[PDB]
Amino acid sequence: GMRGLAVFISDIRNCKSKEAEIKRINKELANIRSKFKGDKALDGYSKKKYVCKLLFIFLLGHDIDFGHMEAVNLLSSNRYTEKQIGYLFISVLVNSNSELIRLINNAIKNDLASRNPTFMGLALHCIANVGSREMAEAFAGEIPKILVAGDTMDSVKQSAALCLLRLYRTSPDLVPMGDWTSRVVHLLNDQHLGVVTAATSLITTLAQKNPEEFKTSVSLAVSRLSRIVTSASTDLQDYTYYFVPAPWLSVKLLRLLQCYPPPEDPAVRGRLTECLETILNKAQEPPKSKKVQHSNAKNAVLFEAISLIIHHDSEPNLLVRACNQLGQFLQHRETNLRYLALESMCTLASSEFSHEAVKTHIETVINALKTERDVSVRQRAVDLLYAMCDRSNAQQIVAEMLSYLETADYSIREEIVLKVAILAEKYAVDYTWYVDTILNLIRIAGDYVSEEVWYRVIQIVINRDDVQGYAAKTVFEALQAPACHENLVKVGGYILGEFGNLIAGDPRSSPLIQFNLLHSKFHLCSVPTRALLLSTYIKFVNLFPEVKATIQDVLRSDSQLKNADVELQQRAVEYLRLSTVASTDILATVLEEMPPFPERESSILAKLKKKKG
Amino acid sequence: MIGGLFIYNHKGEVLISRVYRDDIGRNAVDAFRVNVIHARQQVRSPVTNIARTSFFHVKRSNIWLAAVTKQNVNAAMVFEFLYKMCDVMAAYFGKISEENIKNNFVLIYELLDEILDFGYPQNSETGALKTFITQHQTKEEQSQITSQVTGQIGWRREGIKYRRNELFLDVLESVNLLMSPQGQVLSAHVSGRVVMKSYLSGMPECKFGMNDKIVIESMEQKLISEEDLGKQSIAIDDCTFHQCVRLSKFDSERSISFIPPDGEFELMRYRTTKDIILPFRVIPLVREVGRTKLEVKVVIKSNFKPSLLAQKIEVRIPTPLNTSGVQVICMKGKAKYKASENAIVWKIKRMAGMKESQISAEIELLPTNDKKKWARPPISMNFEVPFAPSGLKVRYLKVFEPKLNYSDHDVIKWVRYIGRSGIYETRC
Amino acid sequence: SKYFTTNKKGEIFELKAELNNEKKEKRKEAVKKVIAAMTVGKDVSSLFPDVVNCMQTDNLELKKLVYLYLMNYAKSQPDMAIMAVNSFVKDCEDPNPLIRALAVRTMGCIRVDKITEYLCEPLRKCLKDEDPYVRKTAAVCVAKLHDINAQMVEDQGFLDSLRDLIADSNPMVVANAVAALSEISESHPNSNLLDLNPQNINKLLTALNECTEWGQIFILDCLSNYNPKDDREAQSICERVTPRLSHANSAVVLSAVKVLMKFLELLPKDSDYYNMLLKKLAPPLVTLLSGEPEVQYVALRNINLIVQKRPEILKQEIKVFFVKYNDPIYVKLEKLDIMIRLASQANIAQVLAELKEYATEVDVDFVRKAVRAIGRCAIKVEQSAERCVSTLLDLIQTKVNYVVQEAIVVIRDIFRKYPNKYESIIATLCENLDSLDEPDARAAMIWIVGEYAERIDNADELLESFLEGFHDESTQVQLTLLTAIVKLFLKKPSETQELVQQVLSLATQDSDNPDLRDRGYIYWRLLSTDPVTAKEVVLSEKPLISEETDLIEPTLLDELICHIGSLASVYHKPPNAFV
Amino acid sequence: MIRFILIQNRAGKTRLAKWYMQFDDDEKQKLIEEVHAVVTVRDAKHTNFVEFRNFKIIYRRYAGLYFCICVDVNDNNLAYLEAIHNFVEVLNEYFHNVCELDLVFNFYKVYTVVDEMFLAGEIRETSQTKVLKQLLMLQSLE
């Protein structure tokens, strides 16, 4: 019905050398601009053609800086296609020039006054996407007067529902409520699910705002939902897709009710129990159908129902059913199946009820993640075992987890080693063996671990008071290891500085040798390490006098006298002016066993949690 | 020694995937692409380290080239190899682009794997490569190739025949000059190379003379023969060579031996940072009038032999950005202005030596000269000139064919002396 | 050769269809699609049956493409390699030594355990070979064999054979032998390569003189491993280096300078060829920076390294560092940097003119660097320090924090070198605390506090303010505050008691660093003990550091000499630091 | 909710960009390029829902077409996958074995029907017979 548009699509589709595209663009530019910049615009064909061109070009990587008052002219233009392309344009091209917006909102109120479906629908569509505050200003209660106060049909009503849900999720401030419970909950009793879906959505929003507002919901909702489960697909056949019963609306209802507390009722939630048995006893069957979509919907609503049951775990038998189901579920050849199963399980993983029942599947998890070649699944499994971990399993868990981690990514490496270390401390009673575990960890990398981690283990040590001789001796062992890991250096150096006496009746215990050794390492590190080693060195003498004279000689070297910084200057200063010049009593006086650290809460957990997204 | 060596386009996909190590991973390569090939920031380096892994990835053109290694090497030889690679790619097929790579794929691959095997880089002497490396051996050919490999002679030497034996030289002297805008030569240096185009038979070693330790002293000896204490000749500030020379022979007796290949090539490049000849006496300077006007004074005294004729004389005289009132001066040539670069183009059709064309400029402004201020863009003279600025020239030239027939006299020689002064810039 | 770059969507079965044509054309084009697949990284191992049955042929290009495909995909499928070894044998019985060497390199490009014995004596006959390419590829695939399993008496006998092949006349074979063994030295029994000896040194030197740049550089790095027993042989060696000027230089030059500095430790009075080289070295160094931006860039790295190691005659060639517009930002940076390092007391006037010029240019980064450098010049000769005062002051008055930010630390260090001189600016600084965003600059201000809290009397209110920051700030900031407060209480005990007590309680109970907590420990058990004694240590002066200005760790430098030419040195980060 | 809805051809370029928030040229373009690269490198054993460094997209690959719909963390992927499958059915049903050239002349039709059954970042409708009915009866609206 208009040449320019179609012929332009034709030609520029056939144009390939971007310069030819540009040429055709400029030809249409002359055409349309001059037709609007002069050559006054004509109503149906010309406007529609040129404006659809303008819109799609705006989409093609351009923009229209005109014709928007004339796009109002499209809204005020006979053909529905003109009004519609205006609808879209202003909905697609975010507007300016509030007088434009003024005419827009006026025309919107007219398209409402025009109580025909299409006008109001498209108007709500532009209201949602353009989303100017003035809409929800003029339509704070007006869109209510649309969706209620007059209740006729579905399509336009869920249109208004999604519009107002946008305006509410974006501007609930422009929403005064009072009370409208009865209407929407009767909609929940409406069998015309066209509204009821978007209804339950927005109602779920408001219940996130006000669950308490809707207990009247609960009874009617659970009745209707038990019905949905029991009345699957025999009628409302276009409410029926692949003969599933209202999957989206049912999931809406279940997740809504999931905000509400666990089961407490005997009979209403007895009927709930009935639905639970229904759901599980129906999911168990193999499909008479042969299309995955049915499986998809069934497993989706399965996740929804189970999650609704999840976090309650007051249902031992149901927990058993879930454990069995999950056990079967980590066998489904598509990685995504067992993957989402892993999510659902690690979700449920914290079941004090079924902890052991899950732990049964530990080797399943083990070989799976070993024979996995993916990580997502593996982190789900890590969280799963994590929620359920304990000393007994942890013993081996260390070995297998580490054997996996040595080959992994890098950040996740940090998060995992940190979370497994805090697991260990959750179970650390074999503090000597735990120290050994930490030694192994450091031996793996010991050069990427953050501060609070080894900070914590040092605190543990000074708070442990049991293996400190063992600890010191083993630290020494790690020290004669030829390689270097600066974290090991810091930690074990300080430890022996305070605990080297606890390993002293040995030839390797020879603060002369290890002293000069650390000296070879002394000036090849980061700065804070040097402060640590300065504290350690000043510990040395007052805990090991034999090496003193040598230590004296060495701490006078120009290096520490010329260390560029202010701090290490002063640190070496307060050390030297007290070693060189020594009252010899203030040494021991100051020196102190650095008592076990006062109680804390291991904020490593909250730190990992903030790292947790 | 090295692994993957991958050539890349702009869209980032490989143009080649030429691996030479096991360690190389696809997970590595695509990461390299998405992270270097694609990066929000745009300041990088031809070498790159990502997780203790080196990455000499270069765009030697619109086309890119990625050298991946995790082995500590000499980066310099890596780059030398990259050069030699793209350079021989050009030498064999000129332009290097999509089709240039495609329709050469197989040769590309066999060469790369040869010239560098598992990262161990082999030579690229191409003494007879392109012959059998052509975009099926005989016993004589088998032994022939084996020997030419074992033969310690390259640059296409097997004993050739040319119906004549002639060489045309061209001494290019690039004027590396900066002078103070008030007049003082801040930079007086020259960058020149001996490019040698030859058409001769056989495989002759040649020698050559170019005046040393003193200012300069078959059919045409020389039209500008080296008068005693002649043109500027100095101990070469830096003389660079190419693998035909014998620097052992030099540092023994200050003379290499070069067996040149045939055709065109660069025999030896050289630099001298002293003792040059000035073609003009220009004092290009700007002054400022409070802050409403910037005025530029450009007195371009040209200084060569008036017999010498420089043509298409285009001098770059930037006009002040803010322009309210112009003040133009004309002496000789053509008045041309440059907008979008804000410049007086005192474009002169031609200039003889020892000349002077003055243009004085005032351009009214608005104050913007602040703690951050106007950038003074060096006024430069750009033009055409062939020249022997140092005039350090052929002290002699010893060529022959001491194998069968054609002697020195049986060779006809040439040279050009093309000065090059686009580096004539000063305003600040 | 033309591009194919297509593999998907059942066209694998079209690939079959053309493979269901033995005729050369469909075969070659199908092959080109296979190469497309291999480039785009899509496995075509399924064709190994097709590849092997069509592989019965005699075409050289077909042989080569089969070599590549077979190799790189049996990499992904060791199973069907049974097919390969047969052909590889057939080729080792193909009198073409070049085709044989191609077989050898494709083969030795894979090592598991079986092709090993299949080639061993054939490999030894490639060692007992007379063709440069056959023996060459033999050495290369012996190196490649060392990828794994390089511990066997068989590979050891091969090592003996090639180890005698170290003595080799063939330039190619001896050259890759040198390269190979030098790489094998990276296998670390730390007893590698016992073939070094004076006559060997001389013969390989001659070779270098006559062998390609490859073998030359290999010889150079090997010499970088051999340790002469005195300078006389080293004298003769540097004479051998005398002709090692302009070549395929960059690599050769860097490695040569490495080997020389390895012997360049004696005095230029011991030999003047020493100081002859010292003086002669500058113009080639300029060429290094007169080369190509990347190689001049490497050269700048190496030059900073040298100036660090050897502060000498280059002290008059700062000209090379003379920045220009066209110069790229970082090159300009290092230019200016070594310019400062090549402090020209003559030029410092016009140098600083240029410097403020740069300050008046349009990039934050180089501006901050130049501010630091000017501050160093203030730490340098005092005269400059006055123009530094004026300039850095007006730069403060530019009121762009980041400049002033690092400038705070700059002046902190200057005043550390030069205290109680221009305290007048501390007043101005007092306003400038409402922009503290650099732990460096903040620590500089707190350092000022600790310095002059006796002169600073308004210290009280500003400090009780600064008590807003106790947490969420990096420990050094804490420690700086703590020592400043310690200094203060020493110089002004009259009103620091409440301060020291609250801050000690906090920093010791809110502590996580045991050094911080026990430092609070020491702080009280010195100040509760004897401030009367504390002052003598603390309140007495702490001598300066005497012009570090970005010094270098010698040993690190000394060991990176073993890398000057290699990535480690040029990168100025330890070779160990990257693996 | 539905962050946006992107559809690209086997020829690269996103042949339908459909959004639900105020994404921007830089943002939309990054989305396009990154998602496209992912789709390319993503081989066949994959899902229809890939997380991109902070949340997911419900993507749907086809020999020529790649229907990518963005959601975040919680939405039950399966339901939306079936919804997308349904919508594809509807399209080629009405578009009668659509070739891309059809939408090149009728992209707006696809767009407005999307707007019809999907709204505000959510499904506005899902009713196959009714969808086709209302479409056709309103595929006659001038």
Numbering used by the authors:
A (entry chain A): 9 to 621
B (entry chain M): 1 to 135, 142 to 223, 236 to 446
C (entry chain B): 4 to 582
D (entry chain S): 1 to 142
Quote the paper.
Clathrin-mediated endocytosis (CME) is a vital multistep process in all eukaryotes in which plasma membrane cargo proteins are first concentrated into a patch by clathrin adaptors, which are themselves clustered by interaction with a polymeric clathrin scaffold. The most abundant clathrin adaptor is the 300-kDa heterotetrameric adaptor protein 2 (AP2) complex, consisting of α, β2, μ2, and σ2 subunits. AP2 plays a central role in CME through binding plasma membrane phosphatidylinositol 4,5-bisphosphate [PtdIns(4,5)P2], the two most common cargo motifs (YxxΦ and [ED]xxxL[LI]), clathrin, and other regulatory/accessory proteins [reviewed in (1)].
Inclusion of an additional “dileucine” [ED]xxxL[LI]-containing cargo resulted in tilting of α, and movement of β2 away from σ2 to further expose its [ED]xxxL[LI]-binding site. Helices 2 and 5 in σ2 are poorly resolved, and the proposed β2 N-terminal PdIns(4,5)P2-binding site now contacts the membrane as does a region in the vicinity of helices 2 and 3 of μ2. In vesicles and buds with both [ED]xxxL[LI] and YxxΦ cargoes, the dimeric form of AP2 is absent, likely because the N-terminal helix of β2 has moved to contact the membrane and can no longer contribute to dimerization interface.
